[PDB]
């Protein structure tokens, strides 16, 4: 019943609402975090995600209390600390992709091992960005639907599926924001944990290499 | 608690399934259906959806029995019956708009009232084709997107969404079909279905314009 | 040095531009059209490109005088006397796609034997529309982009190039309409003639299944 | 007649071939470069793109020999010293995008100024990846077209327009590599010269915000 689930990213904002949710649900529930003191509830691993080692001692930990990943979702959005010019922030986008590549790669083993799995990406929460801002989110997004693609491909027929979430407005000069929202408001962070949910679950084991967007006709067109 | 559902094409297939999936989530669960005989256990009536009068009579019928229709699933889905030459099936490729231009427009009257409501619009199941097939396919799509993503900023902040759920290779030679598929399998109508159901509930109200795949990764890139 | 080049739908605005860019380039340039007056200086056959052996007769007359079609454009863009309720306008959607399939297959014969070819599709001219206009739009466009990308994996390493040109406004109240232009002007026929020209040029060579869009930014977002 | 081009990354590969062509069509063209010595025929001013000092510094020696750039080539592709794991390469594909920032955001100075200009962003040749090696392709991308599309939203109806060229395979086993482009071949650097010249040119005045893939069929679908 229960499953191993880790949360990257899930001491804060969506990442933090992602994890409630599946702990809620009766997940067990690891968390990475970089600094600060983590919220209660969860197995939280002080580490940084872009250092192959940091992550081989983290899932070493997790393994050895929680047994091997099940879930995986990486929140790859901009966190407290990191959100400089648009310009300079670029570096910081790139650590968030690396980032991401070494936590999937080290649970693909497990997950084919056991001939199961669900990973899923989280892009950064819409901000007013200017034009450098809106770039650097685009090729976020990209990145991540680009290595979920690539994976669904590469792993074929091993029932292990790859998707991405990308939320938009999220509640965390309001009504001037919303005006280019068609359902006209913010998302509530449990709107996008519940569509986390629903991709980690075996009613959507059919959908992978697939972007799923929680962001109120935002980006539509 | 129970909503009234009204699922177009709802006789077989994909349709059924899905008029059996809100069925058991207990809600009330009208079809119409073009030809054939309708599934028991449901409200269900005969008529041609590209064929405004029948369409208002049906939506009369139905909901002087369940109530205003609160979910609508317009299955636009290529049917059996319809399933001529590529340069002839583009005028079933109009056909099928039209009925659910028709049916969604009906729909979208009661839904504006209730400030509340979720229409999804079902694609058609992919197969082999040639080149003008694929186009045919390729403007079916994309006419149903179009439609969901127009509504979507029209309708605005009125609490109703519009998605489109595409599916891929369903179960309705077998390993030769499903070697493009990166899951290597097809779906089950019922993954179909599972999807439908998690659109129109209230844990996807920040979904709307989106383009749901359900397709073990084949159209992906 | 000279190429024969067919315009289908040539008469009139954007097509009789293209014919004329051609013309200017020192093609052999015959057009078809269906209604109105010829442009005087082309070879320009009258007849309903949906109907099989009015194309194989439009050709047969054009290349006994211009020698085997190189290029081939097929304008399937609304024409003037199309410009119905939009229910009904899916049937003008499903002509203006049969048309483009009959041309094209029957170009694509010589284009095999020749090992060379240019194919260019053009979409109709952006208008203000409602829903289901916006979505007969969409299905009118990506049919062509469909085709144009299925013919490129199906005639392979052959030399032909299948492209789509997808206009924006052109000019064939205006201060209102072009205030959703970036670029902030109506499109000029003959800007859109450039593009077609350059696509069929020897330096596009290695451009196929391409869409391209003329459309001063409209689009793009 | 003769214009000020510079070519950012312009000293080898597809970025030397771009230059070239301007060059020898008339124009006064400048390039960047980082090290070795640069090819003969141009402006060559050695510096890190990346920072915005050496920017200015390089945009000070080329305005006060050519002229204010009317033409900005900026060659985002990843260079010989950069192609470390695919990983660790992700910081690499972010100092392309930010060093593309910085001499974009210099060039439309003096653009704004002269009420016109191009700018036109390449993205990088195609090679054989993993899936990390992929995802950085993507995300390099996208950023680029993110950019771009932004920047004609903020520029408006300043006829200052903004481009992508998506090269695919550049000839620069071979059988194999083909196999996946529909042309069955590579592309010659000349083809994607041709199309940066023509959007480049006043041909292209109406075209902005767009991707043109140079790709022989490869990323179509």
Known sequence: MSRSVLVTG????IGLAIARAFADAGDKVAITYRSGEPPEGFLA??????????????????????GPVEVLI????????????????????????????RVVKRANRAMLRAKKGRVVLISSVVGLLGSAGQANYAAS??????????????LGSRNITFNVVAPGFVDTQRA??????????????????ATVRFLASDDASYITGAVIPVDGGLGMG
């Open 141 to 154: 997004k990209a990145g991540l639907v680009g290595f979920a693609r690539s994976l669904a491909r590469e």
């Open 74 to 101: 990486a929140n790859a959005g901009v966190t407290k600390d990191q959100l400089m010019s648009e310009e300079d922030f670029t570096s910081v986008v790139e650590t968030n992709l690396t980032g991401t590549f």
């Open 10 to 13: 899930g001491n804060r904002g």
């Open 45 to 66: 691993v002080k580490c940084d995600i872009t250092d192959t080692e940091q992550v081989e001692q983290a899932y070493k930990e997790i393994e050895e209390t929680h």
């Open 176 to 193: 001037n924001i919303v005006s280019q929202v068609p359902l006209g408001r913010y998302a509530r962070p449990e709107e996008i944990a």
